[PDB]
Design an enzyme around this catalytic site. Structure first.
Site, short mmCIF file in Angstrom:
data_model
loop_
_atom_site.label_atom_id
_atom_site.label_comp_id
_atom_site.label_asym_id
_atom_site.label_seq_id
_atom_site.Cartn_x
_atom_site.Cartn_y
_atom_site.Cartn_z
N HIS A 41 0.89 -1.26 -0.16
CA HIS A 41 0.03 -0.04 0.05
C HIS A 41 0.87 1.37 -0.11
CE1 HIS A 41 -0.12 -0.16 4.45
NE2 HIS A 41 0.20 1.14 4.37
N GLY A 143 2.21 6.20 9.52
CA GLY A 143 3.73 6.20 9.22
C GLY A 143 4.36 5.10 10.02
N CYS A 145 3.38 1.90 9.42
CA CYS A 145 3.20 0.47 8.49
C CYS A 145 4.76 0.28 7.93
CB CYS A 145 2.21 0.87 7.52
SG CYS A 145 0.54 1.31 7.92
C1 LIG Z 1 -2.60 3.28 5.98
C2 LIG Z 1 -4.14 2.95 6.54
C3 LIG Z 1 -3.75 2.37 8.00
O1 LIG Z 1 -4.63 1.53 8.56
N1 LIG Z 1 -2.80 2.71 8.49
C4 LIG Z 1 -2.38 2.61 9.96
N2 LIG Z 1 -2.01 1.37 10.36
N3 LIG Z 1 -1.76 1.35 11.92
C5 LIG Z 1 -2.16 2.62 12.00
N4 LIG Z 1 -2.50 3.26 10.98
C6 LIG Z 1 -2.83 4.59 10.80
C7 LIG Z 1 -4.50 4.95 11.01
C8 LIG Z 1 -3.35 5.19 12.18
C9 LIG Z 1 -4.96 3.92 6.48
C10 LIG Z 1 -6.52 3.64 6.49
O2 LIG Z 1 -6.61 2.89 5.10
C11 LIG Z 1 -5.71 1.61 5.22
C12 LIG Z 1 -6.55 0.42 4.59
C13 LIG Z 1 -5.50 -0.63 4.56
C14 LIG Z 1 -4.53 -0.60 5.07
C15 LIG Z 1 -3.73 0.49 5.72
C16 LIG Z 1 -4.57 1.62 5.79
#
Ligand SMILES: C[C@@]1(C(=O)Nc2nncn2C2CC2)CCOc2ccccc21
Ligand SMILES: C[C@@]1(C(=O)Nc2nncn2C2CC2)CCOc2ccccc21
Lengths: 304, 304
Positions: A41, A143, A145
């Site tokens: 992603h 950030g 991920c």
């Molecule tokens: C990148 C995202 C995400 O969940 N990021 C994430 N992960 N742990 C914490 N955070 C931040 C939100 C605090 C954003 C939402 O949509 C999606 C959808 C699918 C996969 C990733 C994501």
């Protein structure tokens, strides 16, 4: 003595964290040998997340679009491929700090350490368990991920998790290092609800054994039970069923303390039925399930 | 989101752990520049611990009696001195992995990470707080003495603790890196009982703010209180008195959430008087006091 929610020393994994940027998106990557692993992603805009077609989004990306920075030095990207939900970026330099490593896919109930990172830099380390509904309850902001979960066997780092997502309920989802999600989760900004978060029974029993070893014995009673009787109570309390495999795994703790596994099950049963009555076990007011029987032995013997 | 008992990444401190042996006794040392720091009780037999005269026991020791091993390589000891309850062993080689560092003496209520070690090798890392009775509740077995507690400000490691002792109650005691014990404890195998382990009120309030930021809001009520009124309840519940300095320190968390510090005190007051009623806050059934207001801000903003 004393018993703590302990994470593995993170040094070996800190030496692998890099920053990966694609377009406006920056997250973490794991650099092992000449490959940098990161969530696919990274190629998405916030808008793309609603319904991304990763193969199509990836055709528009070239090796020079993936900016990889290790500390303050840029890595040259000479290849890129998608394996399930991770991207593997081939770089022209092997990570000099690559430890001996394995990629393992853990089972629910298993524990690991997470090195939470931001922009390729480590922020902290904490101990997790893969929940029985295949989520983890981490601490992950935007950030984070690409941060990884791991275990260490002396000098070998077994990477088991890579962070990808936060569910609308605040729980976390991710993949093993082959890019396969744990559980039914998908890397898409959509309605995804987790199943029942049951309690890892074998872990609670292991933690009750740690409490006895470390002096907390008030919960020990005059009763015993059977697997079938225990499991009726476990079912009622949303606890995982206990199998003969779990009893066998608790064998060494049973031996060390002289408390038979089924006797400890009867102690657990009374704790479920009666509560703690305002008392604590190893400084906790709830029954802890994020220590495996192997974690208990490791910590109680001093493995390095 | 999500909030965890997080320790600092331990890599910078792992690079400093060495093994120190004196006679039959082996413990851990901290190697920074050309000095190895370790508990002076390394010079004692188990028998000496009952009533050791450290100056007299030390006269019988020469530089060649202190065996220092960094990984699998021996360090040449060219000087030795005793500063309070630590020995400083001058070696002929500066530690190449010495990070930027400070020696700080923390206050009760302050938190730090401990890298538990055995024979100079790291076993795990966990987060601690210096209790108001100057003890810590760690996880320390025989051979763990010389393990250190620390904080990190970006690239600078502030060492604040060195492990020396386990009290007969299972709690832990140690020194700052100048060898001065925290609290009234002495490095002698004698009756030493800790005072009241009160609850670090400002830390609990900081953790209540983390819970609101991370979605756990059930405990928020329609009340307010005053410092004096709150402190009457705090006294009754063995909580540290809250001062205007603590209110000021919680200012940023109050600002970020829009909940006034005294309103959160009234929420805490009702939690003390009424209990949790079987509910949890950030996965805990007790009020957590091992997060400072600085730890909450750090974790909630993603500092690396
Ligand atoms: C990148 C995202 C995400 O969940 N990021 C994430 N992960 N742990 C914490 N955070 C931040 C939100 C605090 C954003 C939402 O949509 C999606 C959808 C699918 C996969 C990733 C994501
Ligand atoms: C070395 C010793 C000790 O307490 N060691 C220690 N520390 N944390 C854990 N352990 C092991 C006991 C588990 C032993 C007892 O007499 C004393 C007396 C004073 C100082 C140290 C000590």
């Amino acid at each position: 003595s004393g018993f703590r929610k302990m994470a593995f020393p993170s040094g070996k994994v800190e030496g692998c964290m890099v920053q990966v940027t694609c377009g406006t998106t920056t997250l973490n990557g794991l650099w092992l040998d000449d490959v940098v692993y990161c969530p696919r992603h990274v190629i998405c805009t916030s808008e793309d997340m609603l319904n991304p077609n990763y193969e199509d989004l990836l055709i528009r990306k070239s090796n020079h679009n993936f900016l990889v920075q290790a500390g303050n030095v840029q890595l040259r990207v000479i290849g890129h491929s998608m394996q399930n939900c991770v991207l593997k970026l081939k770089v022209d330099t092997a990570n000099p700090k690559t430890p001996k490593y394995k990629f393992v896919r853990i089972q629910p109930g298993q524990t690991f350490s997470v090195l939470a990172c931001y922009n390729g830099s480590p922020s902290g380390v904490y101990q997790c368990a893969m929940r029985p509904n295949f989520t983890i309850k981490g601490s992950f902001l935007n950030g984070s991920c690409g941060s990884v979960g791991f275990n260490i066997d002396y000098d070998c780092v077994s990477f088991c998790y890579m962070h990808h997502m936060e569910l609308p309920t605040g729980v976390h989802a991710g993949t093993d290092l082959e890019g396969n999600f744990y559980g039914p989760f998908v890397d898409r900004q959509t309605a995804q609800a987790a199943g029942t978060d049951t309690t890892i029974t074998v872990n609670v029993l292991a933690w009750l054994y740690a409490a006895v070893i470390n002096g907390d014995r008030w919960f020990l009673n005059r009763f015993t039970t059977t697997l079938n009787d225990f499991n009726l109570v476990a079912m009622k309390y949303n606890y995982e069923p206990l199998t003969q495999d779990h009893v066998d795994i608790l064998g060494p703790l049973s031996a060390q303390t002289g408390i038979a596994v089924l006797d400890m099950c009867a102690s657990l049963k009374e704790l479920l039925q009666n509560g703690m009555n305002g008392r604590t076990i190893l400084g906790s007011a709830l029954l802890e399930d994020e220590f495996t029987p192997f974690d208990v032995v490791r910590q109680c013997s001093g493995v390095t």
